[PDB]
Design a protein around this ligand. Sequence first.
Ligand SMILES: *[C@@H]1O[C@H](CO)[C@@H](O[C@@H]2O[C@H](CO)[C@@H](O)[C@H](O)[C@H]2NC(C)=O)[C@H](O)[C@H]1NC(C)=O
Ligand SMILES: *[C@@H]1O[C@H](CO)[C@@H](O[C@@H]2O[C@H](CO)[C@@H](O)[C@H](O)[C@H]2NC(C)=O)[C@H](O)[C@H]1NC(C)=O
Ligand SMILES: *[C@@H]1O[C@H](CO)[C@@H](O[C@@H]2O[C@H](CO)[C@@H](O)[C@H](O)[C@H]2NC(C)=O)[C@H](O)[C@H]1NC(C)=O
Ligand SMILES: *[C@@H]1O[C@H](CO)[C@@H](O)[C@H](O)[C@H]1NC(C)=O
Ligand SMILES: *[C@@H]1O[C@H](CO)[C@@H](O)[C@H](O)[C@H]1NC(C)=O
Ligand SMILES: *[C@@H]1O[C@H](CO)[C@@H](O)[C@H](O)[C@H]1NC(C)=O
Ligand SMILES: *[C@@H]1O[C@H](CO)[C@@H](O)[C@H](O)[C@H]1NC(C)=O
Lengths: 75, 226, 213, 49
Amino acid sequence: NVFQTRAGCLIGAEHVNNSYECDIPIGAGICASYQTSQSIIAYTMSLGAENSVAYSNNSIAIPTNFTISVTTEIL
Amino acid sequence: LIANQFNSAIGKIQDSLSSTASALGKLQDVVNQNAQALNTLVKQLSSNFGAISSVLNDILSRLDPPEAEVQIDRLITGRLQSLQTYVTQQLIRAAEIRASANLAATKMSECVLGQSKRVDFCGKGYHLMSFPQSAPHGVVFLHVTYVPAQEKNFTTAPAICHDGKAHFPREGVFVSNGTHWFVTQRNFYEPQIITTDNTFVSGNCDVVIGIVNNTVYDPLQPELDS
Amino acid sequence: PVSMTKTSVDCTMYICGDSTECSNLLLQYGSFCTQLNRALTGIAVEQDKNTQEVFAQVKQIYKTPPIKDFGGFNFSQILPDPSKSKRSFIEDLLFNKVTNGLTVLPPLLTDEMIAQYTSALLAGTITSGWTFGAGAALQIPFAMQMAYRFNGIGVTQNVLYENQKLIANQFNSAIGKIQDSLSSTASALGKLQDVVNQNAQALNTLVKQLSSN
Amino acid sequence: IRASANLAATKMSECVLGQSKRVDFCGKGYHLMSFPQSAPHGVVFLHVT
Ligand SMILES: *[C@@H]1O[C@H](CO)[C@@H](O[C@@H]2O[C@H](CO)[C@@H](O)[C@H](O)[C@H]2NC(C)=O)[C@H](O)[C@H]1NC(C)=O
Ligand SMILES: *[C@@H]1O[C@H](CO)[C@@H](O[C@@H]2O[C@H](CO)[C@@H](O)[C@H](O)[C@H]2NC(C)=O)[C@H](O)[C@H]1NC(C)=O
Ligand SMILES: *[C@@H]1O[C@H](CO)[C@@H](O[C@@H]2O[C@H](CO)[C@@H](O)[C@H](O)[C@H]2NC(C)=O)[C@H](O)[C@H]1NC(C)=O
Ligand SMILES: *[C@@H]1O[C@H](CO)[C@@H](O)[C@H](O)[C@H]1NC(C)=O
Ligand SMILES: *[C@@H]1O[C@H](CO)[C@@H](O)[C@H](O)[C@H]1NC(C)=O
Ligand SMILES: *[C@@H]1O[C@H](CO)[C@@H](O)[C@H](O)[C@H]1NC(C)=O
Ligand SMILES: *[C@@H]1O[C@H](CO)[C@@H](O)[C@H](O)[C@H]1NC(C)=O
């Protein structure tokens, strides 16, 4: 049960194919987290759900409804 | 609904702040950091620094002055140098805070006192307003940000021909619901009947890329005809 | 500059590398190490915080569609090159102009990772306008975007389209010029070179001090 | 570095993700747009003005 990464030798973590958000940062793009029965996994941190945009000469995407949100910024 | 949307929005912050104190890390660290600096500064008093003991009152009760002078000097050069270290930390750290304070003032200057136009300066999105809120050793803002939600594809073209000439939209972009062409504002869909009252003239159809044949309505003709 | 080299230093090796007779004398100095080692560590995470808040301003990672019909605007130099690191051409030059207890921690966001951001931040910028900062990125054909972007300095859209081909050509030829300017003088990247240099100097000066009586 | 980084972020935040109106903040001229490009330890912008 050993994973080798560019930052060093990480023991105690199962290497995982699936990418998820980073919970704890390790180095060289590998992040660890505690998931399900549960154990510690390390993985290539997902940069998020990839996307792509239906670019065209001839279309627009104009929203029909919005939100009024509130977030907190703290200084 | 927008009123209610804002109302329900605010109550959510009540829960998120109430649920977790982790939301206030950016203030808690500042209290934490200074508390750490003080604790380190306090603990240094116990270090012997090479002196026979770390209590001044001992050394004075322990040695006569001609030899105690040497030992006390060891603390002084060390303990001062630790205090010197702490002050340098504070100056640098205070600059960081003062950097945020000026940023805080500017946000209060431009996001409370008015609507900022700097993208991602008052939270993600087309900013509306902010409500400053007190806090220990810091400030908290409740930004109110417009974020688009429900979206529909449409087919676009930068212009239309009515008589072989070019129309652009004074405000909006050209769209179609598949059979009929509409021009609408840019961040919340509302189609409109493309009339000359919304459109302006510029050139003809032989230079524009994407322009499409269309019919523009003139409100004037029905009045003259009727 | 954005980030520094995440240097970390062990006081105990630096000051008493493998010497029991020494580390005993270091303990008498109390907590100078633990704070120094804490100080640089605080620097280290700050750099990763720098790179996250500089680049990762975007939630979803966009990728460009197979068609490049950018109204004549030619971005082939700035988009990542799929056949190489999925990095771009102009940046490829940029990586080419640059060059005891002392360890170098690696950056959390790897260079390949860094490129994807700069591909995404570039991708939504191209196909979606500014809307990808506010929320859901909305596809908009690029020639439309300039009509907005010209509308953003007080020149109505009729300038762009009535001058579409030239302006694209002007921007296209413009793009090539940086390639020459970057390729010609290494002084184009003076600031970043400095960021490396004083950092290189700091370490060297730090290293040399070991020779002083 | 940090002040530049926050200056860098604001330049992506305001000048990439939108169109800035701060004269002499996105290069000399009435700003149009900008394309970030990765770089070692730093970032390069291509301010199109
Ligand atoms: C596109 O919008 C137009 C504008 O309303 C629609 O045309 C109208 O359709 C209604 C029926 O729902 C008729 O009563 C009107 O007489 C129509 N207007 C005209 C000028 O003929 C059209 O149906 C819409 N089409 C789609 C596919 O959305
Ligand atoms: C828009 O419609 C006009 C019709 O009024 C088109 O003009 C004709 O174009 C064809 C070629 O496409 C010529 O052979 C005809 O002689 C033109 N008619 C006249 C009266 O000159 C025009 O091409 C259309 N343009 C678009 C972009 O749809
Ligand atoms: C953008 O410009 C580049 C030139 O820098 C074009 O690439 C050239 O394409 C021609 C035709 O296939 C080749 O003969 C050249 O060798 C290519 N040179 C380079 C440097 O790529 C590219 O096709 C242009 N893209 C668009 C969409 O116009
Ligand atoms: C990922 O999947 C590949 C097969 O496609 C396999 O060889 C590899 O061991 C897997 N790794 C993990 C961590 O599941
Ligand atoms: C937007 O969505 C809400 C429900 O979330 C709905 O009640 C409202 O009618 C919608 N607005 C428009 C303009 O359709
Ligand atoms: C627009 O069309 C594309 C496919 O052409 C689709 O993936 C996308 O979800 C559509 N967007 C909307 C808002 O309908
Ligand atoms: C956009 O690309 C399509 C190819 O699918 C082409 O047929 C069309 O003419 C292009 N639009 C313009 C305005 O040239």
